[PDB]
Subunit: 261 residues, 4 copies
């Protein structure tokens, strides 16, 4: 086996669906004990589905914006497992709003989940990784903010720029303690968030929006939750023991093309 995560303990935020679910599945397939962290009531069934496929999956229903409850959850995971090796911060919200139409509710919702939620998760995990003398943190950014941007994404792009900068500073601070910190910057991925955005843009024909996005990618398809989980698994593994402080673009050359398609 080139990848062996047996006896490693991972927490994945956003584990109930989308890329977090993909990351939890790949870590579990590699032999990790995985905890799905999600506010969604679907998270228990998500962990159940993985146990039925022979995987060591567990859940905690908790809101990552509640620092006290999240800290209590991670302390409990570390206590009952004896260690914490891997954190994937995949929980996020993708709300769009034109800059002049932004209200305090929208600003707060996107930044609390995307920024403070990743902050709270890292802050609860790092102490347990220091006890272990070993940790891997994989943050989810976006191409939106650090690389490219469209109109209508100022708060989301601000939130993912924050993750980009936070990732580099956390990597720098804990390199000497063998905690490696990296970000995945996904392009157009086939998730519930993307399907919802497609329905918002064209309620009559959401599939036609998905088809147009796929045609603008040089690889001619959206990324999958498996593609995202595969890169998170690589970064969590002994195959990536020298790779830290980097933001890796996973986009099928969507941001590479000089003219679109």
């Amino acid at each position: 086996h080139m990848i062996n995560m047996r006896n490693r303990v991972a927490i994945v935020t956003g584990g109930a669906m989308g890329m977090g679910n993909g990351c939890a599945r790949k870590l579990a397939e590699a032999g990790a004990k995985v905890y799905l962290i999600d506010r969604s009531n679907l998270v228990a069934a998500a962990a159940q589905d993985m146990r039925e496929a022979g995987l060591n999956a567990n859940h905690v229903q908790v809101d990552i914006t509640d620092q006290e409850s999240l800290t209590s959850a991670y302390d409990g995971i570390a206590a009952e497992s004896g260690r914490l090796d891997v954190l994937v911060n995949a929980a996020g919200v993708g709300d769009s709003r034109m800059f002049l139409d932004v209200d305090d509710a929208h600003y707060k919702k996107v930044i609390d989940v995307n920024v403070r939620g990743t902050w709270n998760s890292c802050r609860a995990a790092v102490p347990h990784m220091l006890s272990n003398k070993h940790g891997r943190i994989i943050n989810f950014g976006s191409i939106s903010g650090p690389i490219v941007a469209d109109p209508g994404w100022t708060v989301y792009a601000l939130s993912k720029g924050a993750i980009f900068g936070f990732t580099k500073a956390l990597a720098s601070e804990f390199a000497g303690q063998n905690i490696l910190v990296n970000a995945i910057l996904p392009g157009s991925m086939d998730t519930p968030m993307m399907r919802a955005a497609a329905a918002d843009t064209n309620p009559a024909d959401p599939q036609s929006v998905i088809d147009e996005i796929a045609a603008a990618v040089p690889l001619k398809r959206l990324g999958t939750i498996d593609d995202a989980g595969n890169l998170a698994l690589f970064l969590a593994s002994d195959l990536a023991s020298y790779l830290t402080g980097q933001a890796i673009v996973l986009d099928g050359a969507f941001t590479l093309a000089e003219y679109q398609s």
Copy 2:
């Protein structure tokens, strides 16, 4: 004159001192009517010193984290000047804290000023730049977050990564309305913020810390408020009318050196 800002109106946050003061001075020297926006009591003397050098300088003492008061201030500037051409977001705080020692007060202070303050400033200015059919926004990021990082800067680097991303999204959103938005990413610059950080590292001999920083820069000096103001003036000017959505590193090759 290759640069002529005569008849243009500029708002500069952080205008009392440091790079904001440099930006306001260079815009004013190029002929702009400049307003220094700053919470510091030093802002009155800063505007007075520019008027004494023959420059068209004004101030509003206001906290950029107070969105209602900031909006009132910018609406008043636009009403009395008849236009708003240029916004420079230089106001910021440089507080360092080890990640595990961060408390809610530190997190909130740095993000409120560095992120929400730049947000509030852009949100109050953009309506006036749309009326003007023309606007230039220069945000101050840092090399810290987007390019490099040291231990003890998680909140600051998060705040400057936020500015990096926000800059690109605002540029994308308003390019069609001729509002150009760019960020300056300074390296080690000789400002009150840097002098305060030097005194924190070695209270007995702050100058020795400044000297060590200068020796680590390939150009062998810190940047100046003039260097920063010169780049802000370029970005605000007709010399930069096709340049938008970019984060320009102004660092004397500090981030370039390999070893």
Copy 3:
């Protein structure tokens, strides 16, 4: 005056037309003594047109891929001027060819002009800049290679990646001697090269190709030779005395847009 280049001496390669001509004009308007370097016999007329507008413009017809003729030309410029302050490497070729169809002649033509030409120009200039303890080098890269790429541009993108890397290493090497080195990475610019490419892609309606390119830029226009010259003038000036080792994208947010 915020910019004063009065009696600084500048060499601009590719000075006969396109962005090189824009850079030479802006430096000369700021008061520089400018030499247009070009292989084209049109370079004499280009310098004449600037002198007729009251500018201090001169030409040398020389091939930048001939190291030994270019070195003789720059030595002559420095000897007759007493100094050399500014070098703009704007000469380039923009030939496209699908990777499997590349032949040695292609590969050589694009890399000799774009890479070895910039190499030869910097190598002949730097000693004269060191004599007066001051130099500014502005290299022309592209967004193509360092930032984005389309099919059919492997050799061009290779050449502009080379300029990107060379710019950073030359900046690092001479920072301590006050030679500042930066690159401009232009997007879609309105030059003779672009106009020729538009005519090639649609001889029936070249302007419609220019209009389609302009519509893909968030600012809704191509860049001009003036936009390019304006940034080179900034980088050559006392306004940019702390800025070195950087590659600046001048593209009206063409590479920023998530959807075109």
Copy 4:
């Protein structure tokens, strides 16, 4: 098994030692049939060492700057194997020279191997990967040129900038034909090239130079040929089927540290 390269054919340039040897070993451990391409007299023994560990390794002693001989070698590999899935371009030279001391021989040596050698390798492989309906190309760039640079590396950094740009253009051109192209940008790695540079800087005590470089890395060690091979294996595998056109920095945060 998360990674299975069984029945895949890989060509690795620079396979005799250093990071090329690491890449060939990791691809072979994952089940690939690997051909070590190298001018070094060591290359036969390198392939023999892998066969002694039960791995499917072969060699061709050939100079990548000889386009006709390299093309003949790759044509022979594809004909005898029926396939070509993976190309790793690790062969390179690391010669340093101050800019004003560069001569035609130095310029030619570094650019012929680092640039034209990668070009010749890709040009010989791509036709076989199109027949295969599948290819993965991993080019070796450096942090030197695209990210950072020290004095004395103008030709090397030019060569690695060329690889950076060529990687992106080749990725763009072949994305639609399922050839994925990426670059690894290593930092300070423990290879014969690095050990040669260490011995050049201090012949009496090369290890002290290696120790100083390791101390400048936040992870406090040099990268290994295994670290490099592990990233090349990832990029060659089904785990990276949506990752193309990227230059990935593998450096233990060497380029990240501010001060």
